[PDB]
């Protein structure tokens, strides 16, 4: 039965962004420059799981009719829409920041403050909000007014134009520039390992983790995307079987959300520290000649 | 200037099946349902089905759903109804038409009118 | 289903008066439509939105409504204003249309 699973699903986003959230909002020792962003990311992850994943279970349980009022709809998209776009961009903006912080490590450190968080936060957030603003202006166009009669979706004909350029914009631009930081980045270690006698393993170890970080990126949100722009851009193709694959590949996207936590704050030795820490709750001598 | 055409009267026998045509000119065929309608003679009106041009969507009424069929050709953009197994009882007018619709925003919803009804065709059929 | 109910069946009136016509519903509904039919030829819309008049119609109609109750009326009747009219909701399927009300002169 589908419920249970899903629910199994929906729950652990939910935990796993609010403890990090009391954690950093909690403790002294947990507040600096950096961890600023990563709570970004987990209110975008929480409100994800939040109000999204159950009215699209509800939906599923259903015959795919609109059970809630009329005008609820379009709002329902620009929620998706935001949050999704929001999440991406965090993604990238995290790899990019690393990069340079590897390649000149005593810049990062004066340049890096609160002040430049503030500002990078901002900007995503407006970059998400301008990215999905268009849908509500354009309403649906339904042939009668009964909710229940109805189905919430992006048709072809009314926003083909919009599904094109916001799969243009909101994944491929993030993928090129992930793609290139990665090759950059690995390059940088390789030619700094060369120059600086037992930190080889160290290097090594890290270059294994960041491709293993990239590749579930990859995986989780490539094929959703190819599939909706090979849908606009295929007249010949059977518009019947893409929707049939599309609607069990948005829940690959759905499911990245809750996984992406996880892997930030366990690797960090210093959310591990508080939380123990809160459970809880040879020298240099001298001679007279 | 929205124009629908429609094939001219047809005399069939008792037991047989026969299609219907619609062809569409002035706008863009993709865009907007499809319904159909019969009317008897000195009677009122009856509603049959509507068909989705770009991907074939259709619904039904449930008394007609084991004697219509309807299909659709985008690039000769006609719409098509079949009835099979003909009584004498189904010998009317058959309308097909263009109907309005509503846009909703995240304010309100309101209704645009653009309804069009093209001139009907007679079948009768008779031993 | 929504059953329509239409009321009066026939009717006369002399040039020169106002008259109305009503039409019923099963259930609830939020909206009803009107249109006219003359003989030989296919229906055209008449009024919408329970209140708004099609583009060409004249001034003298108009329509009231509310929840389970239509209806439409004339300010003053004219020669020219003898056909037949349907009243039909656009709430759920299956659509479903009134049965319909002829009006004819009185001399």
């Known amino acids: 039965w589908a419920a249970l699973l899903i629910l199994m699903v929906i729950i652990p986003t939910i935990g796993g962004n609010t403890l990090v959230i009391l954690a950093v909002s909690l403790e002294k020792k947990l507040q600096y420059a950096t961890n600023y962003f990563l709570m970004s990311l987990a209110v975008a992850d929480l409100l994800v799981g939040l109000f999204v994943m159950p009215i699209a279970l509800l939906t599923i349980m259903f015959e795919a009719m609109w059970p809630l009022p009329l005008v609820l709809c379009p709002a329902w998209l620009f929620l998706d829409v935001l949050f999704s776009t929001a999440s991406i961009w965090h993604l990238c903006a995290i790899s990019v920041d690393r990069y340079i912080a590897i390649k000149k490590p005593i810049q990062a450190n004066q340049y890096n403050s609160r002040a430049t968080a503030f500002i990078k936060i901002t900007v995503v957030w407006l970059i998400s909000i301008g990215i999905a603003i268009p849908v509500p202006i354009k309403g649906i166009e339904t042939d009668v007014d009964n909710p229940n009669n109805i189905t919430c979706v992006l048709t072809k004909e009314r926003f083909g134009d919009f599904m094109l350029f916001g799969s243009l914009a909101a994944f491929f631009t993030p993928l090129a520039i992930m793609i290139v930081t990665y090759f950059l980045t690995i390059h940088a270690l390789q030619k700094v390992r060369l120059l600086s006698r037992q930190t080889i393993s160290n290097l090594q170890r890290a270059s294994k983790v960041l491709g293993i970080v990239f590749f579930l990126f990859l995986l989780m949100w490539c094929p959703f995307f190819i599939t909706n722009i090979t849908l606009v851009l295929c007249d010949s193709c059977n518009q019947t079987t893409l929707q049939m694959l599309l609607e069990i590949f948005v829940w690959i996207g759905y499911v990245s959300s809750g996984v992406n936590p996880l892997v930030y704050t366990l690797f960090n030795k210093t959310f591990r520290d508080a939380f123990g820490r809160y459970i809880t709750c040879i020298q240099s001598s001298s001679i007279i000649l | 200037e929205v124009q629908l055409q429609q094939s001219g009267p047809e005399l069939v026998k008792p037991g047989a099946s026969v299609k219907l045509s619609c062809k569409a000119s002035?706008?863009?065929?993709?865009?907007?349902?499809m319904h159909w309608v019969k009317q008897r003679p000195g009677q009122g009106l009856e509603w049959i089905g509507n068909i989705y041009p770009s991907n074939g969507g259709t619904n039904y009424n449930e008394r007609f759903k084991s004697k219509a069929t309807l299909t659709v050709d985008r690039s000769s953009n006609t719409a098509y109804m079949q009835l099979s197994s003909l009584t004498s009882e189904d010998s009317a007018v058959y309308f097909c038409?263009?109907?309005?619709?509503?846009?909703?925003?995240?304010?309100?919803?309101?209704?645009?009118?653009?309804?069009?009804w093209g001139q009907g065709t007679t079948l009768t059929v008779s031993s | 289903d929504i059953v329509l109910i239409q009321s009066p069946a026939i009717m006369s009136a002399s040039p020169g008066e106002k008259v109305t016509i009503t039409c019923s519903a099963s259930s609830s509904v939020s909206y009803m439509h009107w249109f006219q039919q003359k003989p030989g030829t296919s229906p055209k819309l008449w009024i919408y939105s329970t209140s708004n008049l099609a583009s060409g119609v004249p001034a003298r109609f108009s329509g009231s409504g509310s929840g389970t109750s239509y209806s439409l009326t004339i300010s003053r009747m004219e020669a020219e204003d003898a056909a037949t009219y349907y009243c039909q909701q656009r709430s759920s399927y299956p659509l479903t249309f009134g049965a319909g009300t002829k009006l004819e002169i009185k001399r």
């Open positions: 002035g706008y863009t065929f993709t865009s907007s349902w």
């Open positions: 038409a263009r109907f309005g619709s509503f846009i909703t925003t995240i304010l309100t919803t309101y209704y645009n009118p653009v309804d069009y």
